[PDB]
Swiss-Prot record:
Highest taxon of source: Eukaryota
Disease per record: LIG4 syndrome: Characterized by immunodeficiency and developmental and growth delay. Patients display unusual facial features, microcephaly, growth and/or developmental delay, pancytopenia, and various skin abnormalities.
Organism taxonomic ancestry: Eukaryota, Metazoa, Chordata, Craniata, Vertebrata
Gene name tied to this protein: LIG4
Cellular localisation: Nucleus
Subunit and interaction comment: Interacts with XRCC4; the LIG4-XRCC4 subcomplex has a 1:2 stoichiometry and XRCC4 is required for LIG4 stability. Component of the core long-range non-homologous end joining (NHEJ) complex (also named DNA-PK complex) composed of PRKDC, LIG4, XRCC4, XRCC6/Ku70, XRCC5/Ku86 and NHEJ1/XLF. Additional component of the NHEJ complex includes PAXX. Following autophosphorylation, PRKDC dissociates from DNA, leading to formation of the short-range NHEJ complex, composed of LIG4, XRCC4, XRCC6/Ku70, XRCC5/Ku86 and NHEJ1/XLF. Interacts with DCLRE1C; the interaction is direct. Interacts with APLF.
Leader sequence segment: none
Annotated source species: Homo sapiens
Family the UniProt entry places it in: Belongs to the ATP-dependent DNA ligase family.
Function: DNA ligase involved in DNA non-homologous end joining (NHEJ); required for double-strand break (DSB) repair and V(D)J recombination. Catalyzes the NHEJ ligation step of the broken DNA during DSB repair by resealing the DNA breaks after the gap filling is completed. Joins single-strand breaks in a double-stranded polydeoxynucleotide in an ATP-dependent reaction. LIG4 is mechanistically flexible: it can ligate nicks as well as compatible DNA overhangs alone, while in the presence of XRCC4, it can ligate ends with 2-nucleotides (nt) microhomology and 1-nt gaps.
Distribution of this protein across tissues and organs: Testis, thymus, prostate and heart.
Protein name as catalogued: DNA ligase 4
Length: 70
DNA sequence: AAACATTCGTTCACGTGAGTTCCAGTACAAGTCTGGTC
């Protein structure tokens, strides 16, 4: 972002779907359950920028969580 | 001759080692879900 501001736009990197136990996935779902929004290809959100791979449901970055990927 | 102390074989309680059953931790293998491209 411009100096002294929070990030506004995001660029997709990759899907990850392994490395979490069932309980961790349940807790993550409960945390982010309220903030999921349906994804419409015709009116994509401004904050998230995607290529050919698009999600079924998108969550605004302000309410999401950081994940470590190996 | 009578009273008191000592000794002996017995008795009970409590502690420790070996055998047996049951359950938790560990290991390994297979199944299931996922990711990426061409």
């Amino acid at each position: 972002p411009p100096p002294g501001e929070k990030p506004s736009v995001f660029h997709t990197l990759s899907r990850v779907g392994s490395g979490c136990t069932m309980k961790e996935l349940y807790d993550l779902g409960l945390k982010l359950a309220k903030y999921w929004k349906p994804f419409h290809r015709k009116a994509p959100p401004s904050s998230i920028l995607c290529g050919t791979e698009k999600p079924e449901v998108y969550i605004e970055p302000c309410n999401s969580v950081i994940v470590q990927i190996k």
